[PDB]
């Protein structure tokens, strides 16, 4: 803790030796102990007291930057519990800017407003917050998507927690964490909110409104039952021609794949949430054959995931599927063309499979299937992460970097040059933190350094190449 080791160190008096002190306090400017909210609080107004005591005994460079800077310092290494939301945080500012602080630091000589001192962050953290507070007041669960579909670019994601006012926060454990908990909260809604769109498109078909539908309650209702998606699908299915279903006695009329039998069990029950037949129990199954395609609609094809992946008998057209996703240049731009076309997550994974048991001798209409459903199943990883933090950077690393081992052996057979998927997910789906703010942070620090050194009569001081070495340090080590 460092915090903690601050106290007791400070605690040993010798203030009388300004060297003695000046050590204690150079520690903790690169002390790597992380804090908690509850244990800053506990702490503050004694470290602060000890800091501003320092300086009144030794007039040294270092112990002002402490005090001075000890509200940035100490909020830097913080490790916040985002489940308790911002209360711990605010309850935390309002012990750094209370009025012991104010005359602790003004009857020690020393300011209040320094960058990283307990005015500035006071004010900043407070704004971070509610700006915090404003970006989890959306959608909580499903069935809200379900009543208001509203379709959020995941590149405004956390984007008012990153602005330049905050700039100076960006680097703090507790805010990089917080990107990632928003990004947790709000990237999930959009393919939902994408097929809920779909299924209540008027002017698509039936069969097609009806399939979106079940691809909805499998992906983010399992069994949990909404009654407008049990009426939505209902309505749809009791309107899809029956020419689309395998009649009774046919060979292979039975519904042959876990695909099927659920896509036929909902459909002879009128009820979405059925998903296996009694044995015995007669089911139409959904035509596969080329001639189904009528029945769909033609950007949407591969919503019909059994047909699609019915290779031998059926080529669904995604040439215009994989036009609009090998051009997309967003996030957005990508979930959107996959999730309207019918490539929701569990169809990338099945026509990902269906095609790639084909490699190497694909045909080009079947590479397109390919690419779109392989490019569409690392978008699907990626999507719930996206945000403006280093845990996205984390994250995108992390799945780019299992690209060339998942799909070297393939890229030249579904027509792309090497590395050719990370080409395509790189270009909608590459981090974009605002790095320039890390420097931000330490031209901020620094200048309050230049403040205390000029304050001490010096054109150097120990402080500097410590904190430098410090944020040297996390600069490198984090990005
Ligand atoms: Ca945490
Ligand atoms: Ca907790
Ligand atoms: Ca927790
Ligand atoms: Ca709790
Ligand atoms: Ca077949
Ligand atoms: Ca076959
Ligand atoms: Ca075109
Ligand atoms: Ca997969
Ligand atoms: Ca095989
Ligand atoms: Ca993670
Ligand atoms: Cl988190
Ligand atoms: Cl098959
Ligand atoms: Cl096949
Ligand atoms: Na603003
Ligand atoms: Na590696």
Not at 279 to 304: E, I, Y
Not at 409 to 435: H, I, Q, S, W, Y
Request: hydrophobic share 50%; aromatic share 6%.
């Amino acid at each position: 803790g460092s915090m903690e080791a601050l106290v007791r160190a400070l605690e040993e008096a010798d203030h009388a030796v300004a060297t003695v002190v000046q050590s204690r306090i150079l520690e903790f400017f690169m002390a790597a102990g992380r804090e908690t909210p509850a244990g800053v609080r506990g702490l503050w107004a004694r470290a602060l007291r000890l800091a501003c005591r320092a300086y009144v005994e030794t007039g040294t460079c270092e112990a002002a930057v402490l005090a001075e800077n000890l509200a940035g310092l100490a909020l830097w290494r913080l490790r916040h519990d985002w489940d308790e939301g911002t209360a711990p945080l605010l309850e935390l500012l309002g012990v750094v800017n209370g009025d012991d602080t104010t005359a602790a630091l003004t009857e020690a000589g020393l300011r209040t407003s320094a960058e990283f001192g307990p005015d500035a962050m006071f004010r900043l953290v407070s704004e971070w917050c509610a700006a915090f507070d404003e970006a989890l007041a959306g959608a909580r669960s499903a069935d809200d998507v379900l009543a208001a579909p509203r379709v959020v670019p995941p590149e405004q994601t956390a984007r008012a927690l990153v602005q330049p006012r905050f700039a100076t926060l960006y680097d703090m454990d507790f805010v990089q964490d917080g990107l990632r908990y928003v990004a947790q909260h709000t990237n999930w809604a959009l393919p939902l909110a994408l097929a809920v769109r779909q299924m209540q498109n008027e002017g698509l078909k039936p069969l097609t409104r009806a399939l979106f539908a079940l691809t909805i309650a499998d992906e983010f209702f399992h069994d949990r039952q909404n009654p407008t998606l049990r009426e939505q699908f209902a309505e749809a299915a009791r309107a899809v021609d029956e020419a689309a279903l395998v009649p009774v006695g046919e060979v292979n009329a039975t519904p042959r794949t876990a695909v099927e039998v659920r896509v036929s069990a909902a459909l002879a029950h009128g009820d979405a949430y059925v998903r296996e037949l009694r044995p015995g129990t007669v089911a139409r199954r959904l035509r596969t054959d080329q001639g189904v395609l009528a029945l769909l609609d033609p950007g949407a094809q591969a919503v019909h995931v059994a047909a699609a992946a019915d290779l031998d008998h059926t080529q669904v057209d995604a040439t215009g599927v994989w036009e609009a996703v090998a051009a997309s240049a967003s996030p957005l731009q990508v979930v959107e063309a996959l999730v309207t076309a019918g490539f929701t997550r569990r169809h990338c994974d099945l026509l990902e499979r269906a095609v790639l048991d084909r490699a190497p001798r694909l045909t080009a209409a079947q590479a397109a299937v390919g690419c779109t459903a392989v490019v569409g199943g690392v978008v699907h990883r990626l999507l719930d992460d996206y945000g403006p933090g280093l845990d996205y950077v984390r994250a995108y690393t992390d799945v780019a970097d299992t690209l060339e081992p998942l799909y070297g052996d393939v890229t030249a057979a579904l027509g792309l040059p090497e590395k050719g998927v990370e080409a395509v997910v790189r270009a909608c789906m590459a981090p974009r933190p605002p790095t320039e703010h890390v420097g931000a942070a330490r031209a901020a620090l620094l200048r309050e350094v230049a403040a205390a050194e000029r304050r001490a009569g010096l054109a150097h001081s120990a402080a500097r190449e410590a904190l430098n070495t410090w944020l040297a340090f996390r600069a490198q080590s984090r990005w």
